[PDB]
């Protein structure tokens, strides 16, 4: 009810980010949402003495028909002070990734109950544009904690802990983790049980609230079943020259990750100048070297550690037929997680929708495991991505990304 | 009197840490001073400025300019210094409407709101910063000191504060009269509608009565400006639009600057004149920016200019947007990385046209360029009409599916249909996914000495065919490409090729059909002639048979 003082980082002005083009349907939806938010006092019109801006658009959360306003506070979040005043941070719970079920709740509506520091409001300015710029864009700023701003869960943290105390005391084995507008609630119960504890949890908020438009939803995960991708070599009875070349190629790449990989004896099978399709019998020396490489590849990678002060990097490869491979790392060749997807999810003919869904799932896994989002290296032209990703976005956060314009050879080895 | 509502003032600040201006007022002739005193006396009576004491330490210079061919002087308060120290504002006019997104209107009336501009007060706490001084006759008394009470012309914040103040006034009238449109440009309001002229003129009078609420008067003698409107380089008519006349000059010899001005006109014309081309003329601007240098026009530039004059021989007009109908966008390949498009709703009635140019880059192909043109048109269309048009593209559905299923990047094109108008975009080659049974296997390699630039390229095959070619003025990367070229030259219609060049595979896996490197272009021309080509990669210097042999031959 009293505002927490907030500042930007030293020597750093507010965001002045261009609003990108919006479709007619998205503009209509935002005009309706913001008219209501204005009546409720959450936002207020602003004048031309405010030159700041943050992009806004609208989405439809997974499995609903109602538009949700989404502000892209990525720039403001970079420029906002860090919040260590009461807590040097919320030590990430390592047990969350080990629960059998984790439901994600959109609790962002609760933030609207806390006023925003009067001196910081100007920096949350945004614009609803008009088609063809025929009328002046509608300019607003926030009077309360905005959804999507990193300072919102920080300022509301004291209030959230108090709301949840009765539920935590009564259910001590439940892991509850908050990231931005999301609440991740993990349990080891049978799903039927689980769904009922989640519904118990909703009521604590409804009770405190007395209506949140998306609090009823629930995104169910199962991190204990999350699959990884070790390096595996083919098992064949007939090896062509081409098969062996691909094998030696993959082993050469693996040797950057695993020390004791050897290809001497396997290369020695190719002695001469043979047709690619000619079958080569494996020598005993080559079979042994191959088996020893198999054994090496069953062990973890040496010297792999997570450092919370370094960026997480996510790379994605399109493998075809709706399949995607990805790796998360901080140092080259020190993968902290690898994976593979195959579920296009209503996108069997849209590469870009598939990639957008992959980005969201990888970000979700990254939030659960380490409590922050990775920086993506996306296999797509900037202009294509920039034009379309907002059409398929269903998360309330947005990660960072860069673009890969040269085809990686490593695609072959994660196949 | 009738009470009027005040216009809320916008609070204004100087940039952090800066103070107001303190500029010395030069001296002025006795003639100019007398003129300024009379002008400023009138302005003071009108409430625009007020005399101040000597405590105010700020000052901005004032000038007197002779309005040409007249005995009347005009005043100029030069706020350049204060503007550098005034905060940034929100500028609403950055994005201007495109005529192709407008709707047809039966009537459009213009209202002069020039006098309303001076009912907009300046933030009281900022006025001290606008102080200026009229020098005294012979400098024997103190100068007359004034400051502004209203938005000064030439001050940084006046355009934004004026527009935001008019918009705020107009919002309730627009919201409660959804059958009209209102647009402000300079000192004028433009009011359009589809109402019968009687109802339309009633709305206008109601708008005048609404503006009186704030004491804003509008001339009774209605505006002299009438359709067509000359606006931001366009002609706006009630039911059509075009660009203002495009006149390409005749000239025996062309200058850098002339070509820059010619291309600018051609770019401006390309938004309604179909098929404008500017590549060969823009090539003449490569690298150089000596505005007075003369450039000989290539024969290709003279044809392009000849074609453009033909296109511009007679007027073309666009139609306005009809929201009840779909948008269609049709694209054509023009050559040399140039693409042209038309956006229409009814056949043969374009809303607008445009063009797209290949991005600078080492290697490219038609499918990537078509995709990029689609992304540009989509984004432009969201801006103007708030929706994506349905595309008519010169590429076969089967070609597109082969492309995007096999391309290493994610790519997407929205709803579209094939239009069979040459030249069609196609795939010129496609590499095999598996080695080819029965086809000779070529193991290629090249190498060059970094100092003497001498190198070798060659191959060895499973049939015993071999070649090594000595090369001069070359590099490791050039010889690796040269080796692949030789294998393509010397093989039959089906061929397996084994390379250790990661560089060569990065290029070919990007599937170019045209390159800035003539060597890559030669490789492309050989690939197009083949039936089957499988390209295999192996790591260098690992004792791989075949690769090991030829590496030794070429690095010798
Ligand atoms: C942008 C704009 C510029 C001018 C003009 C500025 C100037 N000078 C006048 C108006 C009224 C507008 N605003 C809108 C909004 C929606 N449809 C239209 N259609 C429309 C406008 C003018 C004519 C005509 N003649 C025909 C149709 N205009
Ligand atoms: O009256 C003036 C006009 C211009 C200047 C300047 F400094 F800008 F040159 C000073 N005094
Ligand atoms: Mg070599």
> What's A270-306 look like in SS3?
HCCCCCCCCEECCCHHHHHHHHHHHHHCCCCCCCCCC
Note whether A375 contacts B: Cβ–Cβ < 8 A: no
Ligand 2: centre distance to CA B19 (Å): 18
- Counting beta carbons within 10 angstroms of the beta carbon of residue B172, is it exposed (0 to 12), middle (13 to 18) or buried (19 or more)? exposed
The C-alpha atoms of residue A306 and residue A242 are separated, in whole angstroms, by 38
Query: Does B372 sit within 8 Å of A134, measured CB to CB?
Result: no
User: Which of B481, B486, B488 lies closest to B458 in space, CA to CA?
Assistant: B486
Strands laid side by side in the B49-51 sheet: B49-51, B144-148, B132-134
- C-alpha distances (whole Å) from A93 to each of A99, B202, B257, B349, B436 are 11, 69, 65, 63, 54
Q: How far apart are the first and last CA of chain A?
A: 55
Q: How deeply is B327 buried, as exposed, middle or buried, from its count of CB atoms within 10 A (0-12, 13-18, 19+)? A: buried
Measured CA distances, A253 to A138, A292, A294, A303 (Å): 54, 16, 14, 18
CA–CA dist B409, A327 (Å, integer): 17
Question: Can you read off the two tokens belonging to residue B313?
Answer: 């021989």
Compute the C-alpha angle A87/A88/A90, nearest 5°.
Answer: 70
- Nearby residues of A289 by Cβ (< 8 Å), 6 or more positions away: A262, A263, A264, A265, A266
Q: Tell me the nearest-neighbour CA distance from B85 into chain A, angstroms.
A: 14
Burial class (CB in 10 A: 0-12, 13-18, 19+), A262: middle
Q: Which of B256, B92, B263 is nearest to B183 (CA)?
A: B92
Residue labelled with tokens 């062309």:
B254
Q: Is B189 in the pocket of ligand 1 (CB under 6 A)?
A: no
Report how far residue A135's alpha carbon sits from residue A127's, in angstroms, rounded to the nearest whole number.
Answer: 12
Ligand 2 interacting residues, C-beta cut-off 6 A = B 23-26, 61
Pick the closest to residue B33 from B70, B78, B71, B73 (CA basis): B73
Can you tell me whether residue A147 is helix, strand or coil? coil
Exposed, middle or buried, B556 (CB in 10 Å: 0-12/13-18/19+)?
Answer: exposed
Of B388, B410, B460, the CB nearest to A352: B410
* Cβ contact A66:A76 at 8 Å: no
Q: For residue B97, give every residue at least 6 positions away whose Cβ sits within 8 Å of its Cβ, in sequence order, or none.
A: A132, A133, A134, B183
- Residue of B71, B62, B59 whose CA lies nearest to B20: B59
Q: How was this structure determined?
A: X-ray
Shortest Cα–Cα distance, B161 to chain A (Å): 6
**Residue B294: enclosing H or E segment and its boundaries?**
strand B294-295
H helices of B132-180, in order, are: 158-175
8 Å CB contact between B271 and B354: yes
The answer to whether B114 and B13 are in contact (CB under 8 A) is no
Put simply, whether A252 touches B (Cβ < 8 Å) is yes
> B400 with A351: CB under 8 angstroms?
no
Q: Which residues of B25-59 are buried (b: 16+ CB within 10 A; e: fewer)?
A: eeebeeebbebbeebbeebeeeebbeebeeebebb
Q: Which backbone phi and psi does B323 adopt, to 5 degrees? A: -60, -15
> Does B431 contact chain A (CB < 8 Å)?
no
For the Cβ of B321 lying below 6 angstroms from any atom of ligand 1, the answer is no
User: Nearest-CA neighbor of B452 among B469, B479, B472?
Assistant: B472
Helix axes A382-392, B366-385, angle to 10 degrees: 50
Residue B25 and residue B8: Cα distance in Å, rounded?
Answer: 33
Name A275's bridge partners. Answer: none
In whole angstroms, give the CA distance from residue B243 to residue B234.
Answer: 4
Evaluate whether A354 touches A293 at the Cβ level (below 8 Å): no
- The Cα–Cα gap between B152 and B549 comes to 82
Q: What are phi and psi of B464, to 5 degrees?
A: 90, 0
Give, as one character, the DSSP assignment of residue B142.
P
Q: Which ligand is nearest to the CA of B443?
A: 3
Segments of A72-158 assigned E as strands: 101-106, 126-128, 138-142
* Six token digits for residue B389: 């048009």
Contact residues, B window 94-153, toward A, CB-based 8 Å cutoff: 95-98, 101-102
Residue B286's contacts (CB-CB under 8 Å, 6 or more residues apart) are none
- DSSP codes joined into one string, B510-531: T--SEESSHHHHHHHHHHHH-S
**Cβ contact B229:B240 at 8 Å:** no
The DSSP output letter for B338 is E
β-strand pairing of A182-187 with A101-106: antiparallel
CB distance B129 to B82 below 8 Å: yes
For residues A116 and A43, is the Cβ–Cβ distance under 8 A? no
Q: Is the dihedral of CA B107, B110, B116, B120 positive or negative?
A: positive
- Of residues A123, A107, A112, A244, the one with CA closest to residue A179: A107
- Enter the tokens of residue B107: 């009537």
Q: Tell me, what DSSP letter sits at residue B118?
A: G
Q: Is A373 helix (H, G, I), strand (E, B) or coil?
A: coil
Asked if residue B228 has a cis previous peptide bond (ω within 30° of 0), the answer is yes
Contact B444, B550 (CB under 8 A): yes
**Do A407 and B443 count as a contact with CB atoms less than 8 A apart?**
no
Helices and strands, counts by H and E, chain B: 13, 25
CA B129 to chain centre: 37
Distance from CA of A381 to the nearest CA of B (A): 8
Across the interface, do B538 and A245 touch by the CB < 8 Å criterion? yes
Calculate how close chain B gets to A135, using CA atoms only, in Å: 7
Supply the angle between the helices B476-489 and B518-529 in degrees, to the nearest 10. Answer: 20
- For B203, phi and psi rounded to 5 degrees? -55, -40
Query: How is residue A377 written in tokens?
Result: 């290296």
- Measure CA B65 to chain center: 37
Resolution in A: 2.1
Best substitution site from B100, B236, B384 to test ligand 1's pocket, by max atoms within 8 Å of Cβ?
B236
- Alpha carbon nearest to ligand 1 atom 7, residue: B231
Q: Which of A55, A245, A317, A349 to mutate to test the interface with B (most CBs of B within 10 A)?
A: A245
- Sign of the alpha-carbon dihedral angle for B515, B517, B522, B526: negative
The Cα B312–Cα B300 span in angstroms is 19
**Within its chain, how far is the Cα of A65 from the centroid?**
23
- CA of B278: how far to CAs of A363, B65, B350, in Å? 45, 43, 21
Nearest atom (ligand 2) to Cα of B62: 1
Q: Report cis status (omega within 30 of 0) of the bond before B423.
A: yes
Distance CA B323, CA B305 (A): 37
Q: Phi, psi (5° rounding) for residue B84? A: -60, -25
Residue for token digits 């170019």?
B512
The chain B residue lying nearest A279, using CA atoms, is B437
CB-CB neighbors (< 8 A) of A252 in chain B: 539, 542
Long-range Cβ contacts of B513-517 (<8 Å, 24+ apart): B513/B364, B513/B365, B513/B366, B513/B428, B513/B429, B514/B363, B514/B364, B514/B365, B515/B362, B515/B363, B515/B364, B516/B361, B516/B362, B516/B363, B517/B362, B517/B363, B517/B481
Going from the Cα of B102 to the center of ligand 1, the distance in angstroms, rounded, reads 7
- The answer to whether A171 touches A197, Cβ cutoff 8 Å, is yes
Q: Where are the alpha helices (DSSP H) in A321-408?
A: 351-370, 382-392
Nearest CA in chain B to A253: B539
- What number of other Cβ atoms are within 10 A of residue A206's Cβ? 13
* Nearest of A40, A57, A43 to residue A116 by alpha carbon: A43
- The interface residues of chain A toward chain B in range 18-47, judged by CB-CB distance below 8 A, are 21-24, 27, 47
Kindly provide the b/e burial profile for residues A49-78, where b requires at least 16 CB atoms within 10 angstroms of the residue's own CB: bbbbbbbbbbbebeeeeebbbbbbbbbbbe
| A–B CB contacts, 8 A cutoff, strictly below | 182
- Compute CA B430 distance to the chain's CA centroid, rounded to the nearest angstrom: 36
Tokens of A177: 């983790």
> And the tokens for B554?
């070429």
The secondary structure of B396-454 as a DSSP string is: -HHHHHHHHHH-SS-----SEEE---SSPB-------SSPPTTSPEEEEEEEE-TTT--
Using alpha carbons, select from A340, A258, A253, A249 the residue that is nearest to residue A299: A258
CA angle (A141 as vertex; A140, A142 as ends), nearest 5: 130
Alpha-carbon gap, residue B360 to B337, rounded angstroms:
10
Give burial (CB, 10 Å; 0-12/13-18/19+) of B541. Answer: exposed
- The H or E element containing residue B461 is strand B455-461
Q: How far apart are CA B18 and CA B85, in angstroms?
A: 6
Instruction: Report chain B residues whose CB lies below 8 A from the CB of A378.
Output: 410
C-beta atoms surrounding A185 within 10 Å: 24
3-state secondary structure of B285: coil
Known binding residues of A for Mg(2+): 106, 181-182
- Yes or no: say if A198 and A119 are a contact pair by the CB < 8 Å rule: no
Residue B409 token pair:
């990047």
Kindly report the number of other CB atoms within 10 A of residue B282's CB atom: 18
Chain B residues with beta carbon closer than 8 angstroms to that of A50: 90
From the CA of B494, how far away is ligand 3's center (Å)? 24
CB B290 within 8 A of CB B303: no
The residues with which B63 forms a beta bridge, in sequence order, are B76
Q: Does A271 touch chain B (CB under 8 A)?
A: yes
Measured from the Cα of B228, ligand 1's closest atom is 25
Q: For residue B552, what are the contacts with CB-CB under 8 A and spacing of at least 6?
A: none
Q: Residue A360 has which token pair?
A: 């969201």
E strand map for B314-389? 328-335, 338-344, 350-357, 363-364
Report CA(A296)–ligand 2 centroid distance (Å).
80
DSSP bridge pairs for A69: A58
Contact call for residues A368 and A98 (beta carbons, < 8 A): no
| Residue A409 · residue A246 · CB < 8 Å | no
Residues, chain B: 556
DSSP secondary structure, A213-239, as one string: SSTT--EEE-GGG-----------SSE
DSSP label at residue A203: H
Decide: helix, strand or coil at residue A113: helix
Last residue before each break in chain A (C–N > 2.5 Å): 210
Residue length of chain A: 415
Which residues from A are below 8 Å from B404, CB to CB?
A: 351
Contact by Cβ (8 Å): B182, B169 = no
Pairwise CB contact (< 8 Å): B90 & A23: no
Helix (H, G, I), strand (E, B) or coil at B494: strand
Neighbours of ion ligand 3 (CB under 5 A): B 445, 551
Residue A248 dihedral angles phi and psi, to the nearest 5°: -60, -35
Residue among B412, B506, B546 whose CB faces A384 most closely? B412
Cα B192 to ligand 1 centroid, rounded to whole Å: 7
Instruction: Compute how many other C-beta atoms are within 10 angstroms of the C-beta atom of residue B425.
Output: 20
CATH architecture for the domain at B441-555: 2-Layer Sandwich (3.30)
Is the distance from the beta carbon of residue B238 to the nearest atom of ligand 1 less than 6 Å? yes
Collapsed DSSP state (helix, strand, coil) of residue B462: coil
- Chain breaks in chain B following residues, C–N > 2.5 Å: none
Binding residues of A: 106, 181-182
From B195, B189, B226, select the one nearest B208 (Cα to Cα). Answer: B189
Structure tokens at B13: 């600040």
Q: Pick A268's closest partner by Cβ from B13, B375, B543.
A: B543
Hey, what's the torsion of the CAs at A280, A282, A283, A289, to 10 degrees?
A: 130
CA proximity to B214, closest of B98, B322, B115, B125: B115
Residues B256 and B291 sit within 8 Å (Cβ to Cβ): yes
């Amino acid at each position: 009810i009293e505002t927490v003082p907030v500042k930007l980082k030293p020597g750093m002005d507010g965001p002045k980010v261009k609003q990108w083009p919006l479709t007619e349907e998205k503009i209509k939806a935002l005009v309706e949402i913001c008219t209501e938010m204005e009546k409720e006092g959450k936002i207020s019109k602003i004048g031309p003495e405010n030159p700041y801006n943050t992009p806004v658009f609208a989405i439809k959360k997974k499995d609903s028909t109602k538009w949700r306003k989404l502000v892209d506070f990525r720039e403001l979040n970079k420029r906002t002070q860090d919040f260590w005043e009461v807590q040097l941070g919320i030590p990430h719970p390592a047990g969350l990734k080990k629960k059998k079920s984790v439901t994600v709740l959109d609790v962002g509506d609760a933030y609207f109950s806390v006023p925003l520091d009067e001196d910081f409001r100007k920096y949350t300015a945004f614009t609803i544009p008009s088609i063809n710029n025929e009328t002046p864009g509608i300019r607003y700023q926030y009077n309360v904690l905005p959804q999507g701003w990193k300072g919102s869960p920080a300022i509301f943290q004291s209030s959230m802990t108090k709301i949840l105390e009765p539920f935590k005391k009564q259910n001590p084995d439940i892991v509850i983790y908050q990231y931005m507008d999301d609440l991740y609630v993990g349990s080891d119960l049978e799903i039927g049980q689980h769904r009922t504890k989640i519904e118990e949890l909703r009521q604590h908020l409804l009770r405190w609230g007395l209506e949140p438009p998306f609090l009823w939803m629930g995104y169910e995960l199962h991190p204990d079943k999350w699959t990884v991708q070790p390096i595996v070599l083919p098992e064949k009875d007939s090896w062509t020259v081409n098969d062996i070349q691909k094998l030696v190629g993959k082993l050469n790449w693996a040797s950057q990750i695993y020390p004791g990989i050897k290809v001497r004896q396997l290369s020695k099978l190719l002695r001469g100048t043979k047709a690619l399709t000619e079958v080569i019998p494996l020598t005993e020396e080559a079979e042994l070297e191959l088996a020893e490489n198999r054994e090496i590849l069953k062990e973890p990678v040496h010297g792999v550690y997570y450092d919370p002060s370094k960026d997480l990097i996510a790379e994605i490869q399109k493998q075809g037929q709706g399949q995607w491979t990805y790796q998360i790392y901080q140092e080259p060749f020190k993968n902290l997680k690898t994976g593979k997807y195959a579920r296009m999810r209503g996108a069997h003919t849209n590469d870009v929708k598939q990639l957008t869904e992959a980005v969201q799932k990888i970000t979700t896994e990254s939030i659960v495991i380490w409590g922050k989002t990775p920086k993506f290296k996306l296999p797509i032209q900037k202009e294509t991505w920039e034009t379309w990703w907002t059409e398929y976005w269903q998360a309330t956060w947005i990660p960072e990304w860069e673009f890969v314009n040269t085809p990686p050879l490593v695609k072959l080895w994660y196949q | 009197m009738v009470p009027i509502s005040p216009i809320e003032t916008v609070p204004v600040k100087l940039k952090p840490g800066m103070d107001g201006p303190k500029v010395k007022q030069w001296p002025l002739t006795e003639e100019k001073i007398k003129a300024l005193v009379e002008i400023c006396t009138e302005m003071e009576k009108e409430g625009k400025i007020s005399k101040i004491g000597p405590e105010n330490p700020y000052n901005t210079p004032v000038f007197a300019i002779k309005k040409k061919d007249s005995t009347k002087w005009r005043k100029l308060v030069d706020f350049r210094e204060l503007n550098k120290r005034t905060q940034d504002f929100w500028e609403v006019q950055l994005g201007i409407p495109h005529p192709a997104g407008l709707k047809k209107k039966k009537s459009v009336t213009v209202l002069d709101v020039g006098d309303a501009y001076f009912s907009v007060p300046l933030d009281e706490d900022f006025r001290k910063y606008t102080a200026f001084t009229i020098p005294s006759i012979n400098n024997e008394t103190p100068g007359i000191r004034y400051q502004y009470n209203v938005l000064p012309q030439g001050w940084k914040g006046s355009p934004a504060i004026f527009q935001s103040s008019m918009t705020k006034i107009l919002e309730p009238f627009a919201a409660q009269n959804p059958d009209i449109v209102i647009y402000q440009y300079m000192d004028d309001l433009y009011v359009g509608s589809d109402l019968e002229i009687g109802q339309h003129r009633t709305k206008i009078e109601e708008l005048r009565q609404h503006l009186l609420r704030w004491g804003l008067t509008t001339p009774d003698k209605k505006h002299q400006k009438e359709p067509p409107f000359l606006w931001m380089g366009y002609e706006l008519h009630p039911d059509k639009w075009t660009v203002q006349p495009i006149v390409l000059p005749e000239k025996d010899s062309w200058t850098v600057n002339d070509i820059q001005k010619l291309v600018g006109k051609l770019n401006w014309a390309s938004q309604i004149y179909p098929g404008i081309k500017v590549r060969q003329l823009s090539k003449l601007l490569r690298g150089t920016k000596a505005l007075t240098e003369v450039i000989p026009l290539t024969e290709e530039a003279e044809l392009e200019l000849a074609e453009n004059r033909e296109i511009l021989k007679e007027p073309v007009h666009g139609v306005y947007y009809d929201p009840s109908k779909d948008l269609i966008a049709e694209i054509q390949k023009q050559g040399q990385g140039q693409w042209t498009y038309q956006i229409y709703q009814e056949p043969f009635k374009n809303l607008k046209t445009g063009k797209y140019a290949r991005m600078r880059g080492a290697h490219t192909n038609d499918v990537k360029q078509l995709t990029e043109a689609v992304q540009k048109i989509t984004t432009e269309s969201i801006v103007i009409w708030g929706k994506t048009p349905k595309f008519k593209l010169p590429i076969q559905k089967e070609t597109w599916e082969t492309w995007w299923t096999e391309y290493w990047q994610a790519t997407w094109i929205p709803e579209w249909e094939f239009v069979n108008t040459p030249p069609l975009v196609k795939l010129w080659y496609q590499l095999e996914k598996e080695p080819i049974v029965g086809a000779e296997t070529f193991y290629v390699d090249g190498a060059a000495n970094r100092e003497t630039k001498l190198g070798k390229a060659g191959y060895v095959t499973n049939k015993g065919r071999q070649k090594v070619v000595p090369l001069t003025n070359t590099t490791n990367q050039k010889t690796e490409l040269q080796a692949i070229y030789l294998a393509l030259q010397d093989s039959g219609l089906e061929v397996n090729i084994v390379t250790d060049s990661q560089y060569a595979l990065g290029i070919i896996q990007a599937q170019p059909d045209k390159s800035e490197s003539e060597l890559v272009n030669q490789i492309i021309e050989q690939l197009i002639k083949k039936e089957k080509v499988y390209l295999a990669w192996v790591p260098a210097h690992k004792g791989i048979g075949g690769n090991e042999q030829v590496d030794k031959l070429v690095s010798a």
